[PDB]
Amino acid sequence: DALRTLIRLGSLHTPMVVRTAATLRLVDHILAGARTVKALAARTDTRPEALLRLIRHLVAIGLLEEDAPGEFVPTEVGELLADDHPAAQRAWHDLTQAVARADISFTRLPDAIRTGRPTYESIYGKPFYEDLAGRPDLRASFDSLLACDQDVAFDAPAAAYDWTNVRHVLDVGGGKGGFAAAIARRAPHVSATVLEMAGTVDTARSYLKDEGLSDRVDVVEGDFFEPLPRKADAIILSFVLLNWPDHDAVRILTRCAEALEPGGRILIHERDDLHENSFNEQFTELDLRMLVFLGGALRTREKWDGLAASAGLVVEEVRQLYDLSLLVLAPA
Amino acid sequence: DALRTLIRLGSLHTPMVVRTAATLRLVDHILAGARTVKALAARTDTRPEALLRLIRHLVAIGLLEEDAPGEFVPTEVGELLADDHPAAQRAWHDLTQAVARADISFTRLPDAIRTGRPTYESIYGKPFYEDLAGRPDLRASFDSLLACDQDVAFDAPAAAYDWTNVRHVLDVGGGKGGFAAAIARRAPHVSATVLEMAGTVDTARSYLKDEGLSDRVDVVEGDFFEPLPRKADAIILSFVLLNWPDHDAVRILTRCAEALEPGGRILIHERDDLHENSFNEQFTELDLRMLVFLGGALRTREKWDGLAASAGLVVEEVRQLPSDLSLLVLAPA
Numbered sequence A: 001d002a003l004r005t006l007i008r009l010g011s012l013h014t015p016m017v018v019r020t021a022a023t024l025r026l027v028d029h030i031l032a033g034a035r036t037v038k039a040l041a042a043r044t045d046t047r048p049e050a051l052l053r054l055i056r057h058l059v060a061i062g063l064l065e066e067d068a069p070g071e072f073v074p075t076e077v078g079e080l081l082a083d084d085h086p087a088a089q090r091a092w093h094d095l096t097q098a099v100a101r102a103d104i105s106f107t108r109l110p111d112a113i114r115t116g117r118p119t120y121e122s123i124y125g126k127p128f129y130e131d132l133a134g135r136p137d138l139r140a141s142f143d144s145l146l147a148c149d150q151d152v153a154f155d156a157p158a159a160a161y162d163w164t165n166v167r168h169v170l171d172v173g174g175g176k177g178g179f180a181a182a183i184a185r186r187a188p189h190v191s192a193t194v195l196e197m198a199g200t201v202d203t204a205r206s207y208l209k210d211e212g213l214s215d216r217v218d219v220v221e222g223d224f225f226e227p228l229p230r231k232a233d234a235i236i237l238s239f240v241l242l243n244w245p246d247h248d249a250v251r252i253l254t255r256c257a258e259a260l261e262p263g264g265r266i267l268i269h270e271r272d273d274l275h276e277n278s279f280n281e282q283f284t285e286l287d288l289r290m291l292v293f294l295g296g297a298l299r300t301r302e303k304w305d306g307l308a309a310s311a312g313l314v315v316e317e318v319r320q321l322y323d324l325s326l327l328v329l330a331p332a
Numbered sequence B: 001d002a003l004r005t006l007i008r009l010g011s012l013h014t015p016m017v018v019r020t021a022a023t024l025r026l027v028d029h030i031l032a033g034a035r036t037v038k039a040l041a042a043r044t045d046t047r048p049e050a051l052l053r054l055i056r057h058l059v060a061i062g063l064l065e066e067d068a069p070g071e072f073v074p075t076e077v078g079e080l081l082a083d084d085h086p087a088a089q090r091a092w093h094d095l096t097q098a099v100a101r102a103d104i105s106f107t108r109l110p111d112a113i114r115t116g117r118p119t120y121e122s123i124y125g126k127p128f129y130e131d132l133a134g135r136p137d138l139r140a141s142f143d144s145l146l147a148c149d150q151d152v153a154f155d156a157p158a159a160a161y162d163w164t165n166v167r168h169v170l171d172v173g174g175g176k177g178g179f180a181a182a183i184a185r186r187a188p189h190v191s192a193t194v195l196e197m198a199g200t201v202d203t204a205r206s207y208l209k210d211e212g213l214s215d216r217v218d219v220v221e222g223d224f225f226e227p228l229p230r231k232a233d234a235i236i237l238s239f240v241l242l243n244w245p246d247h248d249a250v251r252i253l254t255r256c257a258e259a260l261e262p263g264g265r266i267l268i269h270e271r272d273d274l275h276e277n278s279f280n281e282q283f284t285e286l287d288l289r290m291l292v293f294l295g296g297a298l299r300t301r302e303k304w305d306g307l308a309a310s311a312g313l314v315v316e317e318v319r320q321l322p323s324d325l326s327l328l329v330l331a332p333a
């Protein structure tokens, strides 16, 4: 009934159990033979009696079940925490990796609601990307989480755009380069450049080199708030602007506008929504993460028009493809 | 499908959104006339744009709904966050009160799984009850949270025991006295004493006075690891032993055994799920809280027999209580 539902929604221990079990690679250990609690505790380096208590709640919430007496086995839902599942939900729930670590910022959500400012720095001592610049493991973990998709997640946006009159593509904060590579495979005449931060540029280079695309896709280390390294016919902003508050996003959009060739276009790859369609879990998860990690925000369809106009741009067309959008921006 | 379920179970922002809305008294402000985001931000002292983003997730999870354009209204489930609902779920999710504050100990759950030791102290600087002894606001909201049930939650365990041969009852760690009061109204010949800590003894005394029971129920400040202040025919341990690891629970149980009158009994009011029945959300919520708050634990039916034996006791009988709780009656072995 109504009481049961509210207790479940407000329960902080349940997602922490899911995250703890992910961090211990508990499902992997079961799958690699660790039948009993005794052997599971050995592999995860935990107290048997406490691990049982954890496992009890994992059975209660339907991630593990008991097969034979004392033998715990993942359910269909628990199997998604195997480290080799395509959705990478174990690493995304791993408290040592960048995202689940950043989610501890939600423990201070009232502060963000009162001020509109992110809470990450009050916990970890630096803002999100400064923290990542001083912690190579966090830098690398963040890039690998977002790029867990890379081989196929940019196939759809690359197909949604006519590359016939594109000669060079600049991917501004393009991660490990998977979007650039998707376009390259889709359009052999096109060349590309990825602009990224320290650390990320190295794994982007080796990923692109390992696709056999280093003849087609360059990587430049730099700062997207400074003049861009080069001009281009299509400039990519894929899950970049939501990281930034309005004024920084306009500056980023302004830098991209300065770097368009005649006829060029700015492409935004992001989750958006008509306002009255945005009261959904997918939108809020990303939007509220952006608030507490960085002070960024998801933007409704209506708000893209205004941000575009501040940058001297217009939204020319939107295409729906999670469920993502490709926004095509032209000079106003 | 399976992926959607796991993302929902792992989501940390959803309970923090619930807790934030509880702490801002948001549903209360809506119900007292705040019909816009603008008026709600005024009453909650928050940034309008950020409050809307919070509200968005509250609509997506079914606590709020949009009635008219811009007018957000609690659902049937959201109405349980009204401050005067009998289940007290707003204060139980209020991040300024003791329990939701303590729940932040779950952020370090792997440490407790690795060591078996609570994480509360590493976050707030002192163990649970030392923290509460130095924070009168936290002492008072913890007592008020557990006693939010007071008027009716002890009617069942008091009716599960025959008070015929009982003259005095000692309620060891008995909160604000709600249990002692239930017995008093159940059995007019009975006298009682509540043993509690500083702070709690004062609200226990005024609660009992305000029931008209100060003729029947005394309150004594002290420490139930020391010799108890008095002997009794029935000694109550209601939601006390789960706060403690085995060795500390044996000491408390031993202190009670030393204080029993001839023929006396120890009454344990708690859960007692058979191990095979304990893989359920009620058992695990309380058990995992005790782990990270205090290093205590819920005890299965099987484990009650072991702990009783360590204290020189036997579980004499068990009565399931209607509402799933139990009264366990312990006699000398």
Ligand SMILES: Nc1ncnc2c1ncn2[C@@H]1O[C@H](CSCC[C@H](N)c2nnn[nH]2)[C@@H](O)[C@H]1O
Pocket: A129, A146, A147, A172, A173, A174, A175, A176, A179, A195, A196, A197, A200, A222, A223, A224, A225, A238, A239, A240, A243
């Ligand atoms: N000042 C700056 N100059 C250049 N790049 C930056 C930057 N600040 C952040 N970045 C990069 O912006 C990216 C945002 S994550 C999106 C990565 C990639 N575009 C993608 N698309 N879809 N999934 N992943 C991160 O990598 C950051 O390093």
Ligand SMILES: Nc1ncnc2c1ncn2[C@@H]1O[C@H](CSCC[C@H](N)c2nnn[nH]2)[C@@H](O)[C@H]1O
Pocket: B129, B146, B147, B172, B173, B174, B175, B176, B195, B196, B197, B200, B222, B223, B224, B225, B237, B238, B239, B240, B243
């Ligand atoms: N050394 C000590 N000496 C005396 N009381 C203590 C104590 N340590 C903790 N307590 C008290 O033990 C209580 C546990 S909460 C249960 C309160 C009451 N028995 C009840 N039953 N059902 N709901 N509430 C708290 O109050 C504490 O102060």
